[PDB]
Amino acid sequence: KAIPWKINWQTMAFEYIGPQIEALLGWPQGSWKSVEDWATRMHPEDQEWVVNFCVKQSECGVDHEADYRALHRDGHYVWIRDVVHVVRDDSGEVEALIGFMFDISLEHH
Amino acid sequence: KAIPWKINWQTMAFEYIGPQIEALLGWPQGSWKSVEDWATRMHPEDQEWVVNFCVKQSECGVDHEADYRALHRDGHYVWIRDVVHVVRDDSGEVEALIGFMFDISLEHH
């Protein structure tokens, strides 16, 4: 059920994202190209804080997690928990973000 | 709260594991040396299936997750969900396991 994913820090593009993302959010798996897609497919009141929070924590190399309403292609919202581990390269600089997205619908019933 | 970790498939040793593992399970963070430690610090009825399940799924390169009672150093058990992503090298062979351990105590109250 967990959806694995990884983001290239330099380009901010998705290296990969599990196919379960399609069953969960409906958008074609191949449509998840970059962080911009992740930021767009989110509830308006959540975009208001999640993006800034994740950016700040990532830049500081601090692992983090956020709960928000993800936008399904059909228009309804799905509660998701995004858990992020920050990876640094040999020189100590942020190189990528790796983690999982979890459907936490049951926690909101 | 999530505990990040990674295992070198060849040596089956922990490359790293978040410091939160100490606050959660009590054992010194540096004590988590290999899969053997992970397998030992688990409820006896769970060791009976979790180890075999994870091994089988990992060898097949299939992401998986398992819920089990982890052993705290003080002797009591803590419900944990281990989520695993399998990483393959350039030749297509299993190279490592990366994921997170989550305290799911609230789901068992």
TrEMBL record, chains A, B:
Record-annotated PAC domain positions: 64-105
Signal sequence range: none
The organism's place on the tree of life at top rank: Bacteria
Protein's recorded name: diguanylate cyclase
Organism per entry: Marinobacter nauticus (strain ATCC 700491 / DSM 11845 / VT8) (Marinobacter aquaeolei)
Lineage per the UniProt record: Bacteria, Pseudomonadati, Pseudomonadota, Gammaproteobacteria, Pseudomonadales
Positions spanned in the full protein: 23 to 127 of 312
